[model samples]
Target: GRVTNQLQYLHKVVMKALWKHQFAWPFRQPVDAVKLGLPDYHKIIKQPMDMGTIKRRLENNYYWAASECMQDFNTMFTNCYIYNKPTDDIVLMAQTLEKIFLQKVASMPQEE
Candidate 1:
């Protein structure tokens, strides 16, 4: 079964926010570590790790996932309209939406 239109809309909204905030770089280094006057190792470890090539790869994955979600939404709607079947159960739909949203946030490039 495909994701519902509501899930697709939510995914698009969350993805846009994630792309805007997290994907922008060079990521800001943590200021509190610098303020603490920590050792070089600590400070260095706190710096945002450049995801390097992985960042591009994840970005591509996200783009493709978004495209798939859009197609899935269209297919679901068509099926529902044609066959009069319910689109998605509420709990499952919400869970799926949350997973997609949180997964994007979790995949964000992080400090070491």
Candidate 2:
């Protein structure tokens, strides 16, 4: 029961955080946004978007924070006849503070 209490406490914590930033839900990985032509989508990382990952929380590891912005990726997954492709301008919205934490990570000096 003690473990259950801890889990419940964390559960509430996660719920509130998500709710507070619900405006940015279902966020697409920044790199993934580029394949469709949002070359600047990767820039989203520089902006703040409050959200969480299902797996271990992310740090400045660009590989995880953003997908690989590709060039040959021009040929995206077409459905049926390409009637409607996906989008890239999804706003991070209320998700900001954590992104600031990541911005700091991105600016670290390599020589250090």
Candidate 3:
């Protein structure tokens, strides 16, 4: 019972905070390959990650470990970094989000 509770906290609290981040809009939903005119987005980013996809996975109990959830966030940021220039605002925002995630994970209660 208690083990699952930690997963609940992860999605309910930490995940929600990421969703509300200032630079989160771009990552809230799946990237539109056609709308954005990036026909090669799917080819370039084999695994496209987003907050909504993460949230749904959590709600469905798709992750067996909390660390896996964190990796998804990293994937999202990494994809952004790969697609954008190093000096681009999007890359900077992704870096900021990555820092915020580390801080959040560090503050989490450790398992025995």
Candidate 4:
């Protein structure tokens, strides 16, 4: 994705944790701040975090904790793009991505 070295490092950390934990299930991946949802516009400008951004980011983490039982890692990472593309709150985007992926993955078992 032509990410910065910092972001690349973050992605590596996240991916390593996922592999180390053997978190093969879709919703069990750990959240990495560096690898979490971020918007393209923000990426282009490299915006600094403000109070509201920090607050919403924290809230997103909390929301993620509440929904942890419903998702897996693959879905969480992939679906994050969906939310990040439209929202400024990185944390909420991450949480929503997780939730959406959880729902979609859950539906698969039923179809089988």
Q: Pick the candidate with the highest lDDT.
A: 3
In TM-score terms, candidate 1 sits at 0.22
Report, for every candidate in turn, its global Cα lDDT versus the true structure: 0.38, 0.30, 0.83, 0.36
The per-residue C-alpha lDDT of model 2 at residue 17 equals 47
Taking all chains together, each candidate's TM-score versus the true structure is 0.22, 0.26, 0.87, 0.23
**Candidates in descending lDDT order:** 3, 1, 4, 2
Model 4, position 103: C-alpha lDDT score:
52
Please, what are the lDDT tens digits per residue for candidate 4 over residues 1-112?
A: 2333323332344333333332233233333346645335344433232223323333344323312322234334444444355554544545554454445444332210
- 3 or 4, which is superior by lDDT? 3
Q: Quote the positional error of residue 3 for candidate 2 in Å.
A: 9.7
lDDT of 2 at 98: 38
lDDT minimum window of 10 residues, candidate 3: 1-10
> RMSD to native for every prediction?
18.2, 13.4, 1.8, 15.2
Residue 50's lDDT within candidate 2 is: 23
Candidates 1 and 3: which is better by lDDT?
Answer: 3
Tens-digit lDDT track of model 1 for 18-71: 334532232222223356453453433422222233234334444334444444
Error of 4 at 57 (Å): 28
Candidate 3 RMSD computed on C-alpha atoms after optimal superposition onto the true structure: 1.8
Runs off by more than 4 Å, candidate 1 = 1-65, 85-112
> Candidate 4: what lDDT?
0.36
What is the per-residue lDDT of model 2 for residues 1-112, given as tens digits with 9 covering 90 to 100? 2223222322244323433454434332223444556555445334322234321222222222122211111112111013222332232231242343234334433321
